[PDB]
């Protein structure tokens, strides 16, 4: 799913797909603590999965 | 219940769609680049309605 738009859902930091999740349906595969120190930083994110 | 069967039964907006409501059947050309390409797909949604 990834390699068939590869030239879209490919984003280049961490930030630049913040702005993706919160203008369309998109979702991340990123991982870590990015997403822990994102989650209370504002409560209009929701980490989803272990 | 036949409200609730026929509000289950959404109408089609996308491959997606066609590919879990099996109702409504659907096929492309035979030997032209849309049968080439799902027959390589591995993205289990194109793939489950190229099967």
Known sequence: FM????????????????????????????????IEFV???????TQIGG | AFLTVERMESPIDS??????????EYGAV???ATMT???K???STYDKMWA
Do not use: H
């Open chain 2, 30 to 32: 035979e030997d032209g």
């Open chain 1, 3 to 34: 390699s068939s738009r590869r030239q879209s859902v490919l984003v280049k930091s961490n930030e630049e797909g913040i702005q993706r999740v919160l203008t369309s349906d998109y979702a991340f595969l990123m991982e870590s603590t990015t």
């Open chain 2, 41 to 43: 797909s591995k993205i």
């Open chain 2, 15 to 24: 491959a997606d769609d066609l590919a879990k409501q099996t109702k409504i």
């Open chain 2, 37 to 39: 390409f799902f027959k």
């Open chain 1, 39 to 45: 989650t209370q930083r504002n409560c209009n994110l």
